């Protein structure tokens, strides 16, 4: 339960910061502090804003938005802007329908054709 993906760019500002690029895969090391987590991307370790990342659970895919999509709150359809990162379970090429994704504090159903797997 330690796997996350960076949603937003984070430029290191201070010693021990871990630079984040959108789509980076993070192993969480320490979540003692509510605001600043420690984790590892690739060969690097450091601190980053806890609110800049999204949990990736086993079985879930990570996606980047390639074609923007206007959502609707009453329908539970989440908006996607170009290059937005989101996470959810994909389906086969054969199945038709929106999938449920999470993107930080927003969540909802989205078209798979709006997305490219990363």
């Amino acid at each position: 339960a330690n796997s996350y993906v960076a949603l937003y760019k984070f430029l290191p500002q201070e010693n021990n910061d871990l630079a984040l690029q959108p789509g980076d895969r993070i192993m969480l090391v320490d979540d003692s502090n509510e605001d600043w987590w420690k984790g590892k991307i690739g060969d690097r370790v450091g601190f980053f804003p806890a609110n800049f990342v999204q949990r990736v659970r086993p079985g879930e895919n990570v996606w980047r938005c390639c074609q923007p999509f206007s959502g609707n709150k009453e329908q539970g359809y989440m908006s996607l802007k170009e290059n937005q990162i989101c996470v959810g379970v994909g389906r086969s090429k054969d199945a038709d329908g929106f999938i449920r994704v999470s993107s930080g504090k927003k969540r909802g159903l989205v078209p798979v054709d709006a997305l490219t797997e990363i």
Partner: peptide, 10 residues
Amino acid sequence: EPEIPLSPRP
């Protein structure tokens, strides 16, 4: 895009 926390780093 959330604000980077104003709180101190650990």
